[PDB]
Design a protein around this ligand. Structure first.
Ligand SMILES: [Zn+2]
Lengths: 108, 122, 433
DNA sequence: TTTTTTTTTTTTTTTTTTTTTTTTT
């Protein structure tokens, strides 16, 4: 079937407890298997990372993950690289908002 | 005769006026189309390469014909192709498939689909 | 009384105190179910801005009544969902005048803010980017005759006139007036004795380096009592009408873009390049196909010379023009490429410079590649498609032995800037929401 | 209930209209 996976920012986490989302952000810090990410939202998000992940050496990242029931934590399923070693976060914020407004195109 | 930016969901919601006709999306013929997605599986045949492909809105098969080692799982790609039906299944028949330039293209693409949909629809 | 920002469909007992910042001409139409008239006004107060519109009978009642920069008590009108495709404002709502609508002019102007200006000096305009809002003040030097043209875009006649504006910068710029404001222009008092004109919200075009055009929403004042204008009045009368000026340039298209962005359907629907005078345009399109056969020709090895050469009797490559022969020919592109967008598909031709980036290889490099395997040569071409470009084009008539085809030539092709093409699309979309 | 943001301008280079992914799941 494949359930749609919403593109979200940090403020939408509450709306998807227990659900698989997709989120983009700039890597702030990496502390063991935890990643701290800044969202288009301007809000930060704690991501629990898979054993194999070289996120450390990358600037912007796209995580597919499941939202955890405490607040804004996150069990990473998959992870996608971008930037350099130049994602436009404002562009991203707008796409999030616009995608939310067109469920006929981005959802069930 | 056109090249329509679309989401996999729109591909999936396109109507086929039954028999075996042209597809119709938003009251317009849906021939050639393009989209950006992540490769999730790659099955290789003698005749074709089949990719399982997913863009957060749905999943579809795109098979491209042999007559690609840069492309791997968990990678964004630009897909150009024709929508096809076999035996109640929908898949993209593709010629061109390229690793996405930068992530901004993925973003640009969602907007292009919105914009296109809006212009056929008002 | 309500602040403008306070208005909503949920409250019906309200009155606003607002000044008219701009007013549309009277618009007429016809179609299938309808055919009528309307106009609109923009309104401003402490809290913000709102659009109001009158239809049919409301025009007769209020069009004469409402005048720019004047302040009014408006009351008992509908608050509607804004149609942002037809407006510059960000407001979620707009106002529609119904027959019950009360408008009476005010004697106090002090509560209501006055239109502020962020002036750009004529010499600074080259730093403002095209298709953007801007404020300009300066002396009117002269003005063009009124020209009437059917826009290929719409297919309905348009009144047009051009003014020459000048400031201390010693540079002059063209500005286009449209519609009724254009016609009635010499009606206005003091128009011939070098008045100061002040413009709010004007479009910057790049025709002739930089040029100006008005929007529906744009505004002009003739000799306003504002400190900036007295400076120009004083300046011009003392040494301004003594020195000479600069035209900017890089007949009539003030404010226009020398190659407006178009879609493939627009290019064909507007019959661009089908008359004697060439047309120019920009198109975002995707390369879908490059024609393999005759991609490149064998060209003359003379410095500066590009004419096609042919094998002579000593099996050398002969040029006619430069009357000589070389063992080795140069290879130049004569690219034939099919490009598509969501509105259609179109054929473009490209030459050596632009075709090289389209393939990532000089025609010489391609040739050699074909000499080793067709497979790697068609991979190069196959790899060149499925890529997106901004294309700058001309369209002209060619005369192939009596018969006559339009051709589309690439003058520049730039790869799409996704981030920036993205923000454009955001703007475009928000207008439907 | 109901309608739009308008115009305008130049190379040297082959032939003259091009085949886009072709068939398996
Ligand atoms: Zn020569």
């Amino acid at each position: 079937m494949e359930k749609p996976t919403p593109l979200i920012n940090s403020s939408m986490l509450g709306q998807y407890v227990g659900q698989t989302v997709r989120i983009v952000g700039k890597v702030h810090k990496v502390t063991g298997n935890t990643l701290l990410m800044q969202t288009s939202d301007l809000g930060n998000v704690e991501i629990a990372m898979t054993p194999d992940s070289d996120v450390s050496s990358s600037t912007f990242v796209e995580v597919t993950g499941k939202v955890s029931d405490a607040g804004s934590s996150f069990q990473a399923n998959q992870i996608r690289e971008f930037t350099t070693v130049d994602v436009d976060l404002t562009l991203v914020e707008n796409v999030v908002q616009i995608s939310a407004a067109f469920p006929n195109l981005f959802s069930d | 005769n056109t090249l329509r930016p679309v989401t996999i969901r729109q591909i999936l919601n396109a109507e086929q006026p039954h028999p075996d006709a042209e597809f119709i999306l938003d009251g317009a013929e849906l021939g050639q189309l393009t989209f950006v997605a992540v490769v999730r599986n790659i099955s290789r045949n003698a005749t074709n390469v089949a990719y399982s492909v997913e863009d957060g809105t749905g999943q579809i098969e795109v098979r491209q014909w042999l007559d690609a080692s840069e492309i791997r799982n968990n990678v964004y790609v630009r897909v150009l192709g024709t929508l096809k039906s076999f035996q109640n299944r929908r898949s993209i028949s593709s010629g061109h498939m390229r690793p996405v330039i930068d992530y901004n293209e993925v973003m640009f693409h969602r907007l292009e689909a919105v914009h296109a949909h809006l212009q056929v629809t008002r | 009384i309500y602040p403008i920002e306070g208005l909503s469909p949920y409250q019906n007992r309200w009155t606003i105190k607002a000044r008219v910042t701009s007013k549309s001409d009277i618009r007429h139409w016809s179609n299938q179910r309808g055919e009528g008239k309307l106009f609109s006004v923009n309104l401003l107060d402490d809290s913000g801005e709102i659009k109001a519109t009158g239809f049919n009978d409301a025009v007769d009642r209020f069009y004469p009544l409402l005048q720019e920069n004047h302040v009014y008590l408006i009351s008992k009108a509908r608050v509607n969902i804004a149609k942002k495709q037809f407006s510059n404002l960000q407001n979620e709502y707009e106002i529609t005048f119904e027959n019950s609508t009360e408008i009476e002019e005010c004697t106090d102007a002090t509560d209501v803010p006055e239109v502020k200006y962020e002036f750009v000096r004529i010499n600074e305009l080259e730093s403002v980017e095209a298709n953007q809002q801007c404020d300009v003040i300066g002396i009117l030097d002269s003005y063009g005759e009124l020209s009437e043209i059917v826009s290929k875009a719409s297919q309905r006649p348009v009144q047009k006139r051009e003014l020459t504006l000048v400031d201390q910068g010693n540079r002059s710029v063209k500005l286009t007036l449209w519609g009724k404001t254009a016609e009635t222009f010499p009606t206005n008092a003091g128009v011939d004795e070098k008045p100061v004109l002040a413009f709010k919200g004007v479009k910057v075009g790049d025709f002739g380096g930089r040029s100006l055009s008005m929007f529906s929403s744009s505004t002009m004042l003739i000799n306003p009592d504002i400190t900036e204008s007295h400076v120009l009045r004083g300046w011009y009368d003392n040494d301004g009408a003594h020195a000479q000026f600069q035209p900017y340039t890089n007949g009539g298209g003030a404010g226009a873009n020398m190659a407006e962005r178009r879609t493939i359907v627009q290019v064909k629907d507007e019959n661009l390049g089908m008359s004697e005078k060439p047309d120019y345009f920009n198109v975002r399109a995707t390369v879908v196909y490059i024609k393999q056969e005759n991609l490149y020709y064998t060209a003359c090895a003379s410095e500066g010379c590009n004419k096609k050469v042919n094998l002579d009797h000593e099996n050398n490559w002969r040029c006619e023009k430069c009357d000589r022969s070389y063992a080795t020919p140069e290879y130049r592109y004569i690219l034939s490429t099919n490009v598509a967008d969501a509105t259609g598909q179109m054929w473009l031709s490209g030459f050596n410079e632009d075709a090289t980036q389209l393939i990532g290889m000089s025609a010489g490099e391609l040739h050699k590649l074909r000499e080793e395997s067709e497979s790697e040569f068609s991979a190069a071409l196959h790899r060149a498609a499925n890529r997106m470009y901004m294309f700058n084009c001309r369209a002209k008539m060619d005369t192939f032995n009596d018969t006559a085809r339009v051709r589309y030539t690439i003058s520049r092709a730039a790869p799409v800037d996704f981030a920036k093409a993205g923000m454009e699309l955001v703007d475009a979309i928000r207008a439907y929401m």
